[PDB]
């Protein structure tokens, strides 16, 4: 119940690879209403990304089977996993909208959280239909675009947060919004403008930047 205890236990859960527990601890810590440090926001993101990652992988397997199929068992179990995934995404989005975005006292935090919002709406969009999907896509776009605006004002082009956001927004354009031209435009501009400064970077800086830029290049190769 003390915040320090929750953080301590999140760190233990991380070492123990208990990501659902880790997420729950971090949710409790967020709900104390104080900002998260860089270390702490990374605990939050790692935890929830592992949980949703498992659900997303399962959902893709079941959805694929269900499609090739076209009894109710596959559909039923796919729906069970889908509901669970929606639940987790909604939990993360609730933390972002009830605490994290508005309480963030600096631009870097704000970009990190608005990117997270875009990401979790994107994960919802992957499973969504109908009016739900329309609402979700609009919400994802709005979050990502706000994040983009701040990042272009506040961060240099090789900054890993800025690059990761641009990468994920480009994926949104291609995979979710069915806007390949916007996806390609964004990816190319992002890569080109980052490449322009990589010669000024140190060893560890360059690696962090280049790892994300490699994904920008991989995507462009698939999309072209």
């Amino acid at each position: 119940m003390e915040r320090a205890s929750l953080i301590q236990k999140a760190k233990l859960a991380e070492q123990a690879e208990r990501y659902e527990d880790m997420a729950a601890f971090m949710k409790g810590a967020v709900e104390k209403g104080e900002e998260l440090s860089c270390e702490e926001r990374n605990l939050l993101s790692v935890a929830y990304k592992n949980v949703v990652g498992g659900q997303r992988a399962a959902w893709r397997v079941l959805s694929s089977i269900e499609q090739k199929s076209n009894g109710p068992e596959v559909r039923e179990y796919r729906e069970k996993v889908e509901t669970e995934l929606q639940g987790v995404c909604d939990t993360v989005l609730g933390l972002l909208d009830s605490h994290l975005i508005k309480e963030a006292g600096d631009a870097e935090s704000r970009v990190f959280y608005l990117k997270m919002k875009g990401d979790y709406y994107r994960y919802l969009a992957e499973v969504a239909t109908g009016d739900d999907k329309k609402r979700i896509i609009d919400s994802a776009r709005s979050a990502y675009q706000e994040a983009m605006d701040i990042s272009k004002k506040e961060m240099p082009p090789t900054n890993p947060i800025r690059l990761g956001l641009a990468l994920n927004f480009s994926v949104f354009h291609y995979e979710i919004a069915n806007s390949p031209e916007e996806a390609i435009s964004l990816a190319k501009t992002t890569f080109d403008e980052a490449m322009a400064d990589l010669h000024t970077l140190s060893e560890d800086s360059y690696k962090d930047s280049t790892l994300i830029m490699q994904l920008l290049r991989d995507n462009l190769t698939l999309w072209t």
Partner: peptide
């Protein structure tokens, strides 16, 4: 191959 998001290559 498929579209890759941030963190997918570790």
């Amino acid at each position: 191959l498929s579209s890759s998001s941030c963190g997918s290559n570790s």
